[PDB]
Design a binder for this molecule. Structure first.
Ligand SMILES: CCCCCCCCCCCCCCCCCC(=O)OC[C@H](COP(=O)([O-])OCC(O)COP(=O)([O-])OC[C@@H](COC(=O)CCCCCCCCCCCCCCCCC)OC(=O)CCCCCCCCCCCCCCCCC)OC(=O)CCCCCCCCCCCCCCCCC
Ligand SMILES: CCCCCCCCCCCCCCCCCC(=O)O[C@@H](COC(=O)CCCCCCCCCCCCCCC)COP(=O)(O)OCC[N+](C)(C)C
Ligand SMILES: CCCCCCCCCCCCCCCCCCCC(=O)O[C@H](COC(=O)CCCCCCCCCCCCCC)COP(=O)(O)OCCN
Ligand SMILES: CCCCCCCCCCCCCCCCCCCC(=O)O[C@H](COC(=O)CCCCCCCCCCCCCC)COP(=O)(O)OCCN
Ligand SMILES: CCCCCCCCCCCCCCCCCCCC(=O)O[C@H](COC(=O)CCCCCCCCCCCCCC)COP(=O)(O)OCCN
Ligand SMILES: CCCCCCCCCCCCCCCCCC(=O)OC[C@H](COP(=O)(O)O)OC(=O)CCCCCCCCCCCCCCCCC
Ligand SMILES: COC1=C(OC)C(=O)C(C/C=C(\C)CC/C=C(\C)CC/C=C(\C)CC/C=C(\C)CCC=C(C)C)=C(C)C1=O
Ligand code: SF4
Ligand code: SF4
Ligand code: SF4
Lengths: 64, 262, 286, 134, 150, 267, 199, 157
């Protein structure tokens, strides 16, 4: 009935707005839209190497 | 029992009883005024509530000369302020402070006996203008009361600690200088004040030669055992419960044992 | 940033639980040719909030014959497990995410059994065992369904997983009977119709009771999101609403089973069917 | 956790890396892939919230003491619990199978495993142990 | 027509403008009381006509195309404390579907002793009390004999 | 082994039951009654015959005028009073309206106890229509005090039969949409089939009557074997089933609603 | 349908009986065994894939999109008749004199004994009551007092909304009953103009 | 002082809006009056529209509706169930039997009013009261809940 429509619309709107906000927050944390993908040992090794080499590039930049 | 930013001890124990006695004497049809005070009420008491109570008793006997002053001891009951706070002190706290050796004497009484005492006062015309002290048939110390509660509750760890009175007052001092400018908080014990510490340094018993229960024809009930101690037996560990109930179910009839699944 | 992400997740979960319990009342009313809550706020939109605030200022009944710690711990455990399961849905990247949520939902049995042990009621002890037996019996069909689902979940590198982001974005048409069994298993886990015979919270009042119902509705939303991920090609707001409407629709139109009847159903119908489907899907997957 | 050796830091020297790792933000695409750390924080935060839910009606609610308010208002479960234990162990065994790209001898070994399972289950079915009349 | 909707809303609420309507405490209670909200915003603005007004200010509407038993309704003038005890007896039988008579089509005979309808006084201290009550001006002792006074 | 019975107390909140179980199987049931015993048999000795009539509305308060009927007939037989024809027709018509009200409540309360909630809410609006029929002739929705010694209390108001016909024109559709939720449903069958079986010898030995007796294969209706008022003129069928089931009693009660509709149309 | 199956039997004695003997095949209310392939597929599509749950679901979904029977009390009311027995009231003549003449017939007929009457003669010689009480918490709202009254003095009016907060507010004396009659007089007269054709 | 008293008064307003809009009663369907209470909960009158949910246990119950006659055998059970409800709670007495004994007032087996066992907030008259009259009584109970000022009383203690 017409009385049941507002609560059912509000559930959809709540979940849409909450998922949009959570997406923006986690996108700000991770800076890439594939942070939730499955990662094996090779991909974990690649990310850890990338992080440490980025830190090394930052260390070498503050010396010139 | 505690002071608040809206109400002080003099407002409740002094000013209101005086105005009540005056307005009662103005009507002409009031034949009896029963005012309730405490057994430890004294004008030379260090506790403020006992002193304001005795001052208000004087004002009531001044303004209404046939008013009866009633001074019972500690009153036990289901909704009391005596065993309930002591049980909330034995449980629900890391430790329970006891002022000094706990050798101060008290005379607790049952609430139904006080209710009967009011009707017995209303019957007897001689009791107008007098002062009565209501106390039970047993004189006990606070250590004995704590031991009775610990035996009744079936607690096998004495969590009380005996402390000097200055240490107890030092504990209760921060929550007594802030008792005003506050509308009154829930679950604050009336034992967490210096006035209780001053009351614990004195005896609170019936004076010699005073009028008591016997002059009213009342034999007061025992407080330590019987119906008065049944509410604290419900707060023991596990529950009250009956027992195994099998030694006496031997010669009980047929349907009863199956009904109780014995 | 993790604490911020978790709180930003927690807000719509509780808001959605309030709106679910209102929407259940109103949809159940519309099927029965009435209105449901309309007075309490405009269009009745304040009724769950006034229920929560009414229970907030309600007296907490602590029975002085029970163990106070387990009595307090049971609804806290239920609520915490529901919130943690939601975090596992949305703030995880783990390889075995579906196994993680199955492990969490297997822990949810403890609140029922702690409520049964704590409160000193004769039939609370009788009903907690029945409710636990129902949840325990249908967990196995849920696990075998997860086995059938995981046979086809592979990521880009070729590794098989239960990661939710690697699930396909199309409905799984090949597993329609397994989807129906999954939905009836969800109905059995949440103790809804037709398995609502067992209650265990007969001694709880005020916000402990409120914690029990928030946990129940949040677990229903967790299982709805899980079913939409596994079978409906993704997690979405519309799918959550549609599956909730379906559950309320089933509650409107059906009577409930006896205890031995749903026990025979779960141990002679659903478990052999899920195991046979697992064997058939393993034969297909070679 | 922070790395404690030069080999664990990909042989990057300096003090900027040590402080940068110790004060890093959590990142699934940095050093914390597959980490399960948000599960602990969620437990702590939800326990805090439910404790606040428990404590609050002890302050803002009325209360009255009564002795009546503080009062009370089979072997099939053994079957269910023990059978669930054994079947849960069997499903845990079957899970490494489904997470592999199995060859045919793996398939036939798994089917021998399942056959032993369902043979014991069918024996208990045929003896009338899944009929919950008692 | 939305102009018809707003004209119906203003004639039903008794306000002068939409700005006066939305900034009123009546709209504030209609945000928290949904029964009044439905009655003013949906029912009174729908299909139907105004029948009449009683002396307490309540308005009476009817719609013959509605279902049976939902043809007639009232808009109370007291928005904050609305009560059915303020309906006069010449509107009571019309609104309760007892007869089809109201003052707009029927001239009732008015007795000279008739007391007008007003809101109930229960819950207050000006309610009805028997003559032996404490709240009376002079309580009665109901003795059926006279005592001797010397 | 030597298994003692486990006993259970079933509800103070007005039936009290003391069960015994041998596991999940009941061995004994003992109802404890008297929580609604108000002593109406003693109070009727202190009333005149007209004064004591509204006591009977409050015996089976789901079916009021039928309780009035037997007291009125017992008085009329000793008084040697004849009832006129129109009063007999009115009594038969309102007795059948009463039976429809009772069967609506009984079936839907049973199905709500089993777990189906919607048929209750569907049938109570029809119950509201029949309560309006009670109120239009007696001024009371339930305790009518309508049947009197020698006839009925007041005449039928002009316009009642028109509306009773308008309700009876759609009642079969309401009973049809009621059966779509319950009759061919497996959960309802699995709850009701072969539960609590009553054979004919046990039915007569235990003093049974009504739709219990017809579901065990016994053709016994007092409106056809020992008729009263104008029930001998009425043309209707007696529904018969033969298992003694809960399911068979449910089907017999639905058919009895159909037959009551037939008698209502004839009146 | 009302047909039975071996297996859908709710009990145990009949479940044991149907799986060890073929006595159920003699009973005409049972569904027969399928005889060919298409009948087996029909039976399996009945048992598996439900389709009996779905008919009830289609009916309740049709009811979801249908009309509602709720009235919005107290802005909307129910339907009653002029014979309705509500709050008791005492009536006057159009001049303003009481109709009641203290005959004590309504007090005699009252099965609840909810009426207490005392009377004497008024100073002009008239026969009038000095006490007329109705205990509304003893009243059963039968209307017998309305039937027994020969001058139409006591009535049950059309008011049903008279719930109070204290029980002392429901012990009506004579003055309040006259006040009720003075309130409800025009409606009572309109009702009695129709109901006098029947009574 | 003025601001904090204004805030305290608004806390009472919100709390009373919550408590009146969320009454969960407990059913004592003793007799005749229970059928009219069932009719009040049905689709025509729809007690659920006003936020009323009937609850099986006394621990979740906010009110008690005594709908039917009370006997001497039933009075301690009613008292025991009343004592198990938590605060704040209300009692609605429905119909003549619960109000004052009614038609069984002079019987050897009946309690003359449930006032004699439990205290009562709202009395609904009738035998039976209509479902609409019970709605009137429940709206009056809501009006009684609205006039309460709990935090204003606490603030001035
Ligand atoms: C799958 C299941 C579900 C769980 C998963 C859900 C996810 C988590 C949700 C969180 C749970 C929500 C609700 C929490 C309950 C709140 C407390 C409560 O209600 O009272 C408890 C209450 C206490 O019992 P009681 O009713 O008062 O007494 C009845 C007994 O007969 C009385 O027994 P007793 O008197 O014999 O026992 C006394 C004991 C009572 O124990 C407790 O109080 C319970 C302990 C665990 C409860 C934890 C909750 C919070 C407690 C504080 C934690 C502080 C730890 C440090 C944190 C940093 C703070 C600085 O206290 C002691 O004296 C302990 C002595 C220590 C050991 C001594 C032996 C070694 C000696 C050697 C030398 C000593 C040095 O009952 C329970 O214990 C209920 C158990 C349920 C708790 C949850 C289970 C899982 C916990 C989390 C996972 C574990 C991970 C490890 C991380 C850290 C450890 C926790
Ligand atoms: C065991 C007793 C509790 C121990 C709590 C604890 O260790 O606190 C943690 C965890 O606790 C919290 O931070 C939450 C406090 C709980 C209460 C909050 C209530 C809701 C607002 C501190 O977190 P941080 O070091 O500030 O966060 C690290 C950075 N990162 C955000 C990426 C995770
Ligand atoms: C004073 C001394 C106190 C000593 C307490 C010792 C035990 C600690 C228990 C957990 C404390 C929570 C907060 C501590 C921080 C924390 O999570 O520490 C992690 C250690 O794991 C752990 O501490 C693991 C214990 C986890 C137990 C919680 C169980 C939750 C149950 C819920 C069900 C879960 C289902 C399965 C998913 C690693 O911290 P870090 O160094 O990485 O952090 C900073 C870098 N970001
Ligand atoms: C994964 C798929 C799971 C399938 C589960 C199958 C469960 C089988 C249990 C059957 C027990 C019922 C039963 O009594 O079966 C008898 C033989 O069945 C059998 O011997 C069937 C064995 C099937 C093995 C798989 C029927 O014959 P009976 O021995 O009762 O007949 C002569 C006495 N009346
Ligand atoms: C949204 C919520 C959706 C659910 C709404 C309806 C809820 C219904 C709950 C009650 C269901 C009853 C039930 O499952 O009954 C079983 C049959 O159905 C089932 O077993 C149904 C689940 C399985 C679906 C069909 C699976 C096989 C389809 C074809 C597979 C082979 C071809 C394709 C590979 C067993 O009842 P019974 O009478 O049969 O029990 C045999 C012994 N009495
Ligand atoms: C149904 C009852 C349970 C069936 C499974 C129980 C045993 C588990 C399977 C063990 C399989 C052992 C090797 C099978 C194999 O190599 O077959 C390929 C093999 C390939 O066919 P080929 O072209 O003849 O080599 O299949 C067969 O010829 C055997 C058919 C499978 C039968 C499996 C059960 C054997 C005992 C009956
Ligand atoms: C037939 O099924 C149903 C039941 O039976 C199973 C029920 O029992 C109930 C009633 C029980 C309810 C609603 C309790 C559960 C829900 C709660 C407590 C709502 C949770 C909401 C939260 C935490 C958000 C509200 C808080 C806010 C906005 C913060 C406010 C803060 C400030 C203003 C500063 C309903 C509605 C129901 O349908
Ligand atoms: S209506 Fe009935 S109970 Fe009421 S006063 Fe008249 S006779 Fe007595
Ligand atoms: S109201 Fe009528 S019946 Fe009753 S005493 Fe007066 S005149 Fe007689
Ligand atoms: S007051 Fe009347 S309707 Fe209500 S229970 Fe008593 S006799 Fe039945």
């Amino acid at each position: 009935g017409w009385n049941a429509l507002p609560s059912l619309v509000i559930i959809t709107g709540i979940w849409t707005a909450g998922l949009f906000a959570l997406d923006k927050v986690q996108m700000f944390r991770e800076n890439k839209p594939a942070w939730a993908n499955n990662k094996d040992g090779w991909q974990k090794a690649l990310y850890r190497r990338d992080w440490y080499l980025q830190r090394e590039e930052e260390t070498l930049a503050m010396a010139k | 029992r505690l002071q608040t930013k809206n109400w002080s001890f003099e407002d409740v124990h002094v000013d209101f009883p005086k105005r009540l006695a005056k307005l009662a004497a103005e009507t002409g049809q009031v034949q009896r005024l029963i005012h309730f005070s405490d057994m430890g009420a004294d004008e030379n008491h260090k506790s403020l509530r006992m002193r304001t109570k005795a001052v208000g008793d004087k004002e009531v006997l001044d303004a209404f000369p046939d008013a009866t002053i009633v001074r019972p001891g500690d009153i036990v009951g289901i909704e009391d302020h005596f065993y309930n706070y002591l049980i909330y002190q034995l449980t629900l706290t890391v430790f329970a402070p006891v002022v000094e050796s706990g050798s101060n004497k008290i005379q607790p009484t049952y609430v139904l006996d006080v209710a009967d005492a009011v009707a017995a006062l209303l019957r007897k015309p001689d009791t107008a203008g007098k002062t009565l002290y209501l106390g039970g048939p047993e004189v006990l110390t606070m250590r004995e009361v704590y031991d009775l509660l610990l035996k009744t509750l079936r607690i096998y760890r004495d969590d009380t600690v005996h402390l000097p009175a200055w240490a107890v007052k030092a504990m209760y001092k921060p929550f007594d200088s802030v008792r005003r400018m506050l509308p009154g908080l829930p679950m604050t014990s009336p034992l967490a004040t210096e006035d209780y510490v001053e009351e614990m340094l004195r005896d609170k018993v019936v004076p010699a030669g005073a009028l008591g229960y016997a002059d009213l024809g009342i034999v007061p009930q025992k407080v330590t055992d019987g119906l008065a101690i049944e509410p604290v037996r419900h707060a023991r560990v596990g529950g009250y419960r009956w027992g195994d109930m099998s030694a006496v179910a031997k010669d009980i009839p047929e349907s009863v044992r199956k009904y109780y699944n014995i | 940033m993790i604490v911020a992400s978790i709180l930003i997740l927690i807000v719509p979960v509780l808001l959605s639980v309030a709106m679910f319990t209102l929407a259940e009342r109103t949809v159940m009313a519309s099927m029965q040719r009435r209105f449901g809550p309309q007075v309490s706020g405009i269009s009745g939109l304040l009724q769950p909030f006034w229920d929560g605030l009414k229970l907030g200022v309600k007296e907490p009944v602590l029975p002085d014959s029970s163990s106070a710690g387990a009595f307090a711990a049971s609804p806290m455990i239920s609520f915490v497990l529901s919130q943690v399961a939601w975090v596992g849905i949305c703030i995880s990247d783990a390889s075995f995410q579906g196994l993680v949520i199955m492990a969490i939902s297997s822990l949810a049995v403890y609140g029922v059994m702690l409520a049964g042990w704590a409160s000193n009621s004769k039939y609370a002890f009788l009903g907690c065992l029945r409710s636990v037996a129902l949840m325990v019996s249908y967990e196995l069909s849920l696990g075998a369904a997860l086995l059938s689902i995981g046979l086809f979940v592979t990521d880009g590198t070729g590794m098989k997983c239960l990661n939710f982001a690697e699930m396909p974005t199309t409905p799984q048409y090949a597993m329609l009977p397994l989807c129906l069994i999954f939905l009836v298993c969800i109905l059995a886990e949440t103790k809804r119709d037709p398995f609502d015979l067992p209650g265990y919270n007969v001694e709880y009042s005020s916000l402990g009771f409120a914690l029990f119902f928030i946990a129940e509705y949040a677990n229903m939303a967790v299982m709805s999101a899980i079913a939409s991920i596994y079978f409906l090609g993704g997690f979405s707001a519309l799918k959550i609403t549609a599956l909730f409407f379906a559950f309320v629709w089933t509650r409107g139109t059906l009577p409930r089973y006896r205890y031995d009847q749903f026990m025979r159903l779960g141990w002679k119908a659903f478990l052999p069917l899920t195991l046979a489907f697992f064997a058939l899907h393993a034969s297909v997957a070679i | 956790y922070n790395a404690w050796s030069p080999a664990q830091r990909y042989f990057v020297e300096g003090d900027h890396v040590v402080t940068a790792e110790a004060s890093r933000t959590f990142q699934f695409t940095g050093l914390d892939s597959g980490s399960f750390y948000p599960y602990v924080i969620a437990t702590v935060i939800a326990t805090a919230i439910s404790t606040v839910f428990i404590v609050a009606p002890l302050v803002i609610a009325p209360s009255r003491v009564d002795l009546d308010k503080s009062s009370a208002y089979s072997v099939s479960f053994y079957l269910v619990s023990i059978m669930y234990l054994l079947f849960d162990i069997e499903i845990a065994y079957l899970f490494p199978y489904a997470m592999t790209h199995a060859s045919l001898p793996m398939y036939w070994t798994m089917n021998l495993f399942l056959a032993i399972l369902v043979a014991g289950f069918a024996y208990e079915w045929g003896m009338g142990a899944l009929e919950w009349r008692e | 027509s939305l102009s018809g909707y707003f004209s119906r809303l203003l004639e039903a609420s008794g306000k002068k403008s939409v700005g006066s309507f939305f900034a009123s405490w009546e709209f504030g209670k209609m945000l928290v009381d949904g029964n009044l909200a439905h009655n003013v915003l949906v029912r009174a603005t729908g299909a139907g006509r105004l029948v009449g007004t009683d002396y307490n200010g309540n308005r009476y509407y009817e719609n013959e195309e509605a279902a049976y038993g939902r043809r007639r309704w009232i808009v109370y003038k007291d928005k904050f404390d609305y009560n059915p005890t303020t309906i006069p007896p010449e509107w009571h039988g019309w609104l309760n579907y007892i007869n089809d008579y109201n003052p707009t089509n029927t001239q009732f005979k008015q007795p000279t002793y008739q007391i007008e309808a007003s809101m109930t006084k229960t819950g207050t201290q000006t309610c009805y009390n028997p003559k032996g009550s404490w709240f009376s001006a002079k309580p009665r002792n109901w003795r059926k004999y006279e005592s001797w006074t010397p | 082994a030597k298994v003692n019975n486990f006993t259970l107390n079933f509800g103070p909140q007005v039936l009290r039951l003391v069960l015994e179980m041998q596991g999940e199987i009941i061995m004994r049931a003992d109802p404890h009654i008297g929580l609604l015993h108000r002593g109406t048999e003693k109070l009727l000795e202190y009333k005149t015959y007209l004064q004591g009539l509204p006591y009977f509305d409050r015996l089976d308060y789901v079916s009021m005028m039928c309780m009035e009927h037997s007291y009125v007939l017992a008085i009329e037989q000793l008084l040697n009073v004849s009832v006129p024809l129109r009063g007999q027709y009115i009594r038969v018509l309102f007795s059948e309206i009463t039976r429809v009200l009772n069967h609506l409540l009984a079936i839907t309360c049973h199905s709500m106890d089993v777990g189906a909630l919607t048929p209750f809410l569907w049938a109570f609006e029809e119950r509201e229509k029949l309560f309006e029929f009670y109120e239009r002739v007696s001024g009371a929705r339930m305790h009518a005090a309508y049947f009197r010694v020698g006839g009925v209390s007041q005449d039928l108001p002009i316009g009642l039969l028109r509306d009773v016909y308008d309700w009876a024109r759609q009642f079969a559709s309401r009973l049809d949409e009621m059966e779509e939720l319950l009759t061919g449903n497996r959960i309802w069958k699995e709850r009701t089939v072969d539960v609590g079986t009553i054979t004919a010898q046990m039915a007569w030995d235990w003093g049974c009557s009504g739709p219990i007796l017809r579901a065990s294969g016994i053709d016994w209706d007092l409106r056809k074997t020992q008729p009263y008022d104008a029930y001998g003129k009425m043309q209707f069928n007696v529904p018969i089933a033969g298992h003694g089931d809960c399911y068979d009693r449910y089907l017999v009660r639905l058919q009895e609603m159909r037959e009551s509709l037939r008698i209502i149309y004839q009146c | 349908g009302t047909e039975r199956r071996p297996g859908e039997s709710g009990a145990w004695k009949q479940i044991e009986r149907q799986r060890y003997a073929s006595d159920w095949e003699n009973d005409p209310t049972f569904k027969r065994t399928p005889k060919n392939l298409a009948e087996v597929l029909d039976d399996s599509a009945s048992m598996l894939l439900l389709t009996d749950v779905w008919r009830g679901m289609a009916y309740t979904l049709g009811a979801f999109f249908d009309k509602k029977v709720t009235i919005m009390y107290p802005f909307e009311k129910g339907q009653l008749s002029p014979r309705f027995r509500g709050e008791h009231a005492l009536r006057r003549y159009p001049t303003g004199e009481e109709r009641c003449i203290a005959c004590k017939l309504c007090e005699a007929i009252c099965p609840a004994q909810a009426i207490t009457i005392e009377a004497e003669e008024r100073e002009d010689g008239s026969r009038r009551t000095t006490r007329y009480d109705i205990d509304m918490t003893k009243c059963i709202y039968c209307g017998f007092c309305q039937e027994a009254c020969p001058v139409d003095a006591i009535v049950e009016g059309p008011n049903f909304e008279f719930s109070t907060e204290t029980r002392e507010e429901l012990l009506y004396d004579k003055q309040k009953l006259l006040e009720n009659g003075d309130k409800w007089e025009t409606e009572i007269a309109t009702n009695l103009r129709t109901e006098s054709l029947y009574r | 002082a003025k601001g904090l008293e204004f805030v305290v008064s608004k806390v009472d307003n919100v709390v009373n809006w919550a408590r009146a809009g969320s009454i969960w009663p407990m059913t004592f369907g003793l007799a005749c009056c229970a059928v009219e209470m069932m009719h009040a909960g049905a689709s025509r009158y729809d007690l659920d529209r006003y936020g009323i949910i009937f609850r099986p246990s006394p621990r979740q119950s906010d009110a008690m509706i005594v709908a039917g006659t009370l006997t001497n055998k039933m009075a301690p059970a009613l008292r025991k169930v009343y004592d198990q409800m938590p605060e704040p709670k209300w009692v609605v007495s429905m119909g003549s039997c619960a109000n004052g004994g009614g038609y069984y007032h002079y019987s050897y087996a009946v309690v003359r009013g449930c006032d004699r066992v439990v205290p009562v907030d709202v009395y609904v008259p009738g035998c039976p009261p209509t479902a609409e009259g019970l709605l009137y009584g429940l709206l009056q109970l809501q009006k009684k809940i609205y006039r309460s000022k709990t935090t204003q009383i606490w603030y001035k203690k």
